[PDB]
Every structure is written in structure tokens, then in C-alpha cells.
Amino acid sequence: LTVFQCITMEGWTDVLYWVNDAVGRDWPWIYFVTLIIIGSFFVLNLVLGVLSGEFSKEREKAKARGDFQKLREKQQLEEDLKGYLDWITQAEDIWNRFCRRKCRAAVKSNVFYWLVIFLVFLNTLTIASEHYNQPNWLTEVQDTANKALLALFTAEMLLKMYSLGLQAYFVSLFNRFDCFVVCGGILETILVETKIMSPLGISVLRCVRLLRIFKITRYWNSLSNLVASLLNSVRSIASLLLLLFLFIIIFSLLGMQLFGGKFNFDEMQTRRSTFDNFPQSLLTVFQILTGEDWNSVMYDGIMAYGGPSFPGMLVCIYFIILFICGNYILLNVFLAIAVDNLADAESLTSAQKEEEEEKERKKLFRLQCHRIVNDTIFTNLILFFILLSSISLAAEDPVQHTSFRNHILFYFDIVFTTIFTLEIILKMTAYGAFLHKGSFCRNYFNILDLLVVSVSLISFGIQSSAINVVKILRVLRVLRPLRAINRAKGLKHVVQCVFVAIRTIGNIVIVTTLLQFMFACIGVQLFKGKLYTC
Amino acid sequence: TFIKSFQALPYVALLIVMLFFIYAVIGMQVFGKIALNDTTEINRNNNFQTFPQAVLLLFRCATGEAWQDIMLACMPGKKCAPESEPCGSSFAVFYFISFYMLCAFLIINLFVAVIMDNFDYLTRDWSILGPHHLDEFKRIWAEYDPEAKGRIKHLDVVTLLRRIQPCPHRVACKRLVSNATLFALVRTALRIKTEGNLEQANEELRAIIKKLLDQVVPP
Amino acid sequence: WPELLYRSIDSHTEDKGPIYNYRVEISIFFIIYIIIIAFFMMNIFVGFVIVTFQEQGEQEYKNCELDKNQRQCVEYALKARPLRRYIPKNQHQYKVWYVVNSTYFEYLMFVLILLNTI
Amino acid sequence: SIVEWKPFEIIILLTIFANCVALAIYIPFPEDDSNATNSNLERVEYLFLIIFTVEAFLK
Amino acid sequence: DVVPSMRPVVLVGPSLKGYEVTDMMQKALFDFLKHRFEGRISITRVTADISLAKRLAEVQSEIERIFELARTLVVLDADTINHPAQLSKTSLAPIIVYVKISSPKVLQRLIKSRGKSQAKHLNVQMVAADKLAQCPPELFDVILDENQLEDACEHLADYLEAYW
């Protein structure tokens, strides 16, 4: 039971510290660290591998099921409706209605698009400006800004409504969503004026304003393809989520019949995560699924069913099965949804975008007797010096101010500063020195060698000052190990591939950050200081 | 196979070690002198005093183990340890949040790199023949033949361990007639093409695909 | 998480202390946030990294050539190498070799180790 | 048998849903306590028993 | 045979000209033709038949008056040509344009918006689109694939630079 408690990583460190307090701190960390690494990380890696790889099988079968091919059919379909309805839009106008051409012209113009983006920025700044005890004037500023932005947004919304065909306008998903958010804003105005608004109303309506903040991220396609695939798969998404919801209901209704109201102990009732009533049994089951304080709930159940004994304490079966099935059933549903759909979504960025690109294409100092020698053995030698320099500061004593070892490490620092400035002197001989077409400024990694050396040197320059300036210099001097990157031939490949991965992740990470900001704004609206407790 | 993949991607592991090292050192100097005390996260068992302890604390934070309380422990205003002749910075929030994101990202990166490296086997229907079939064929032949003692020497059908997965319609006899045995099985177990010219067609393939002795391949 | 959830459920009014289970509907906010952000979006991170690495690995897709199974097989075309068996020559050696190498001996030794762990 | 041709399985699944609802309301009081609702859910359970056993007999 | 000093321009639309939608596919289109070919292009409006040409009474002078405008050194618009066959009966060295809807599923959506009177008359309209999906490239010279006007309009001008 305890080893299994460590594999799930929850309550891990508690048993490690309890053991350390019994058999000393020296060796015991080995056991639990190896337990975590081996058990948790290898099993997690293997389950991810055998799901993702398996998910590729069902993806391959799906491609025969026309799942992706049919998706492209609904994309070009709706796409061409606007383009052809544009003709009628441009043909219905060949009472005088010559201003229609001008109003439509601004709609596609960059001036109006960037103006509306800026208005959205003001909208998000106003709501994001929330604050616990707002200055009294800021409340009026926020309210009047909300009124103003509402008036404008509805004005240009109607402008697009009449400038473009109403049917064509409603065809687009984004325009329908914008109509939804503006209607929510109208509701905001009416409810606030009539004073019949309710906390659910303020919550969901601040939410609709924040939705209107989705007007940002419109040009980009990577999120758009994900959204399109998600909308296509909704009828498939709802099945998995319905199944998981049914499973949580079952494992909550079972906990009610097992631990229903048996969590009454003479100890102080901090058992908030209890099984008493169904609305809270769900929260406890959800907590177990994510596995935050799984230990606490399992221990409470064990104690409820007697103490540690054979007839009791068998309850561990329920918690173990719940946790295993959960973090397996959750893993299947969520990886399936985030791989099959995303893999399909990513293929739109490669299927329709790629061919369309083709369609457009189809439509169309001293320099003499220098010594660069010895730069071969010095490769490994500099590697070794970097390694030992890194090890140097690690062994430093942080807690002893008048340290018996800091002066020794100061000697090592002096020696290694000399050694690592030798190659700084050398680099002048090689092409560079910010001259000779700037061969030195074409490899910033080479420059980064000086920066760390400079800070190391700069530490001594102000060291004699005995002043607080040098305090940060020591902290920053830790950049030494990275020097190996520029001196390593594979580590460079690894770090560059990692940066490429980051650049790829950019879209998803920014979408997650924006949606998290949405939820932060809603949370500010709900709990703006209602958490204090004496 | 998973262990072998880990061998082939050591620099990602070295990168993770570099992250741990840099962050352990940074935590060593800023949050070094925090006063140890029970009833708080920074205690005798977690602290940035000795490098092993700093690495252990950062590992604890990596496993998502109440790292938020550690963060709140290192936020400023904390009494400094007696060794000082107060301590605690406001840099903690950025330190721990950045560490969590970066360590999670590199752990994900290592996991998916190994998944990429083992993708071939992790995505294998086990229906088409695989190297396991070749290994069991090698073992049965070794039982039939000790070290490097097979050139033709064949007059029996004891090599019937081949099950339904590659004498049905005597195709086995025809395949036997048509390292040489392994090559013939490979080219014909898949049944790539049947036009009476695969040997010629393959004879024009091994030349471009290859290097080593090809005076036995044609047979 | 649960500490925050059960401190927020007890949120009565601005600048006032908590009340036991005042509004337990608030859990909808935390439930939705949990599922969407954590589960959905971090799993999207993992799936997106998987897809990107799969795409990068298939850079040398070489669709003109045939399956990769033949690739592995022909790269193994240097197989059929000697394998160490060393059938004992001495008959006294041969008896112990046969009894040791029989599957019965292996099964028995597995039972021994299993009982040892028990 | 021909009754199964008549789609009563819809009403049977609505009955299963009704029973699923009739279990969230059942509050499990600590030690034998029971309010009024818990004293009518036994009767509702008897009804569900009868309908399910009739369906089992038919099928 | 002999060019009428010009290559007359016609457009059959994606389906019958008898309804509003087909004309509107070209009503604005013709506007840009003269607005970017000042003096280089001329347009004509007729309502009679031109298929019956021997290279009805109104047809006799119809071919001449077109040739009268062709001798000025031209775009024709009618309701007779629903297929290049309707114009293949005469050899006037013409240029003919075709509006294409690659997905007939779009036809209903376009029809479903203008009016419910002809909404049930889609079968009348769509069959021509089918009829406009058979002629090989030879009778399918001018191509209108892209959707909006600006991208499509640029592909009209390029074919007009064959001679001028």
C-alpha cells in the first residue's frame, strides 16, 4: 500500500521524510528516488507510448473511414458560399444606396480591422483592470468604458450586418459567435438598467464579454483548424465525456453507499472532502481522479471502516480501482480527443493550405604566423575545464558566511578565470573581434562565452568595493555550464531542436494562456476578495 | 527496446541534468540562508543548504508535490538562519513557476523523443512479419545447425516451425526451391511480386539499396 | 487545489468571512477550469508534441520506395551468423546439459524463485 | 415477444434514468437516522424492483 | 473562318440566365471589364437568338448588328447560349466564359437565399449546371474556378492579353 502510494507521486515525500527521521538522512533517499524515477516515470512513459502508438493505428483505420476526407468537404463547402455570395454582394448594388459600396469597402480594409482589434484591446483592458478595492472612480470608468465599447461594437456589428448579406453573414461561424456576444452585451445593458440582474447573470455575462475578446486570434489558422475539427467531432466528443460522467456518477453512488456519513470522527471536522451528500460525493470522486490528496481520503475511508485490520481496511480496493480506472479512462478519452482531432486538425494546415500555395504558383591588428594549432586537444580540455568549473561552485557553502571553503573555491575561481580567459585572448587571433566582416558577431554563442567570463571578471572588479552591487553578480556567474553547449557538437543539436519545438508550440501555448486569462478574469469577478477568513 | 532508445538519446537527459544543476545553484544562493524550522515547508528535510538537498527539493517540486507551499515559504519576510552574522526573496514566485514549466516541458520532450525513437515498434500491427520472426527462425536453425555451419546442407523439412504466419498447397516446397535462405524467405514471405522475375528485379534492387558479399544473395 | 476549492465554496460576500457550504455551485467554475485547461489543453500539448515529432521523424518519408518492413529486413540481410551452442561432447557433461536445458528445469527454477519471494 | 417490437425499451431506459435520479436524493445519514425523503425512497425502490423484475420475466 | 475584326465575348453563367442569380454573377462582373479596359472593350445587350446563323426574322439583323459593332474596332449578352453548342452552330471566332460551381451543393445555398419562389425551381437551374459540366476543354476555354471577384477578375484579364 505504501509503495503504491509513492508510485502515484501523491504524498510521496511524507513517507520519505518519516523514514529519514528514523534511519538518518544519508542513504534512504536512494530507495524512494529510484522508486519514483523507475516506477512512475517509466510506467508513465510506456503508457503514453503504447497509447499514442496505438492511437496511430485507429487514426490509420479512420483515414479509410472518410473521417478526414469528409471533413475537408465541409470546409471548402462553407468557404465557397461567402466567395460566391460576395458576387451577389458586389452585384446586388451593381432611394439611392451608393454608400453600400463605401461601407463594405472599409469592412475589408486594414484600418477598420485594426480599429476593431484595438477596441477589443480596450475591452479586455477594462475588464482586466479589476482590483480588490477599486478606487471609487475606477468603477465609473469601467462602467462607462463598457457602455462605450458596447455601443461601438454593436454599431460596427450592424454595419457588417447590413453591408454584408445577412444570410451570408450568419453562414460564417465567427460572425455568428460575434452576434452571440453582442446580444449578451445588450442583455448586460438591459439587466443592469432594470436592476433585475443576478450573480449567475454577472458571471456568464462578464464571460460573454471575455468571449468577445476572442476577436483576437483571427488571422492565424493553427487554432482555427483545431476549432473546426473540434466542432466536427462534437458528436463524438460528447460520447466519451458522457461515458466518463456516467463512470464518475457510478463511483460516487458507490462511495455514498460505502462511506456515506461514516466520516464522523471525534477529531476536528476538517473532512471537507467527504462522501455525505451526492453533490459533494462528486467533488470527492473528482478530487480522487485528479489525485491531489488521494492519501487523505483513502486514510479516512480506512479509519471509517474500522482501523487497520483484515475485515476493515479492505476499502483500499475501492480507492485503488477508482484511481487506476480514472487516470486510465481519463488518459484514453483526453489523449484520444487531443490526438485524433488535433492530428486531423494539423493535417488541414498541410492539406488545404499546401495545395492552395501551389494554386497561386500554378496561377503564375596583425594577421600573420598566427597559431590556431592545438584547437583539437583543447576541445576536450576545455570541455573538462567547463565540467570542473561547474562542479566548483556547486560544493560551495551557502549557509556559512565566514566559510572555511569559500576561500578555497575563490582560489579555484581565480585559477579557472585565468584558464577561461586564455581562450578569450586566443579568440582575437581567429577571424572576428567584431571586425573582418564581423565573423565574431555571426556566432552569438561565441560571444556568450565572454559574457559569463565578463560577469565572472566583473565580480572581482567590484569585489573590493565591499558593496551590495556584487550580490547579483555571484548569482549570475552560474552561467558557466551552458558554455559546454557551444563547445559540444550534439548538445547544440538538442538545444536547437528544443527551440524549434518551442516555436512550434507557440500557437497552442498562446491559446492556453489566453483561455487561462479568461478564467482568471471570471474568477476575479466571482471572488474579488470574498476569501478572507479570521 | 525502450532501454536501448534511452541510450540513443543521452543529450536530452544531459540537458535535463543541466536544468536541474542551474536551478539548484540558483536556489542555493538566493534562498540559501532561509532559517530552518518545522511547521514550515523549508525544514530540516527540505532546504537550499547542501547541493544534494537542493536537488532533492527541486525534484520534489518536479513531481508536483505541494510546490506551492514551498514557494510561499521562500517568499520574502522570512527570518534568516542563525549562521547569518530579513532573508528570503521575492524572486521565488518566478523561480518556482519557471522551474515547473521548464522541467515539465523537458520531461515531456524526453518522453516524446523516446516515443519518436521507438515509434516503429510502438506502431507495429504485429501482422506483417517482424524481426522477432527472424530471431525465432535463427534460433530454430541454430538448433538445426551450430555455429556458421549452414550453406545448403538441406534435405529435410524439420524446419516446419513456421506456423500459419510466414505444406499448404506445397508452396513451402516451391519457396524452398526458389543467409540465402533468410533472403529468399524475406523476399517471398511478403509475397512482394509474382511475375517470375523478382530475382532479376531484386537483383537490380540489392545493388542500389546497398557493400557486402552479394555472391550468395541471388540464390 | 482542494484547499482553494473549499475556501472558495465558503465565499459569502466581499470583505466577509467564510460560511460553511454557502454556495456549493461554485464548484462548477473549478470543475470546468480543471477539465478544460488541465486535462484538455495539457493533453493537447502532449498530442501536439507527439504529432510534431512524428512529422519531423518522417522528414525522409521516401514514399517512392516500398514499405519500411523491407527496409529493416534488407538492413538485416547481413544476418545468419554463428550462434554459440556448444553441445557438450562428454556424455557425463551431456546428461547434466540435457537435464539443465530442458524446459522442465527452467519451470522448476521459476517455481523455486517464486517460493523464495513468497 | 411482439411487445418488444413495440418500443417500450424507451420507457425502460427512462425508468433506469429515474432510478439513477432516485439515488442522488437518498442521503446516507451517519447512524440509522433518516429524514422523510429516505422513507419514501424505499417505496420508490419497491416500484423499481417490480418494474425491473417484470421486464426480466418478459425478456 | 474570318474574324469579325474582334473576338466577341459572352458569358453563359453557371445555369439558366432566366433567373436573377445567373445575371448577378455577371452584372457586376461586366462593370469591371469596361472599368479596366477603357476604350479597349465594348459591351452589347440583346435578347434574341444567335444560334440560327448561316455563315427568326429578328435574328436576321441580329447577326449583322453584332457584326456592325464588331467592325468598329465586343461583349455580347443574351439568353440563348446555355452551352457552347448553342454557339458552335456558327464560326465567328468568339470567346465564351463559363461560371463554375465545383460543388453543386453550393447551388442550393445560393438559391435558398434569394427567394422561396424559385427555391423549388432549383431543378430547372441545376440541370444547366450539370449541362455546364460536360464539354471538354476545347469548348471550355475560359476558366472561372476561384470564388470571389478580385482573384477571379484577374484571371479574366490575362486571357484578354492574348492579342491586346
Ligand SMILES: CCCCCCCCCCCCCCCC
Ligand atoms: C490492496 C492491498 C491490500 C488488500 C488486502 C488487505 C490487507 C489486510 C492485511 C493487513 C492487515 C493484517 C492485520 C494487521 C494487524 C494490526
Ligand SMILES: CCCCCCCCCCCCCCCC
Ligand atoms: C461530472 C463532473 C463533476 C461535476 C461536479 C459538480 C456537480 C454540481 C454540483 C452542484 C449541484 C447543485 C448544488 C445544490 C444547489 C445549489
Ligand SMILES: CCCCCCCCCCCCCCCC
Ligand atoms: C425522470 C423524472 C422524474 C425523476 C424523479 C422520480 C422520483 C421522485 C420521487 C421522490 C421525490 C421525493 C418525494 C418524497 C416525499 C416528500
Ligand SMILES: [Ca+2]
Ligand atoms: Ca499532493
Ligand SMILES: [Ca+2]
Ligand atoms: Ca499530481
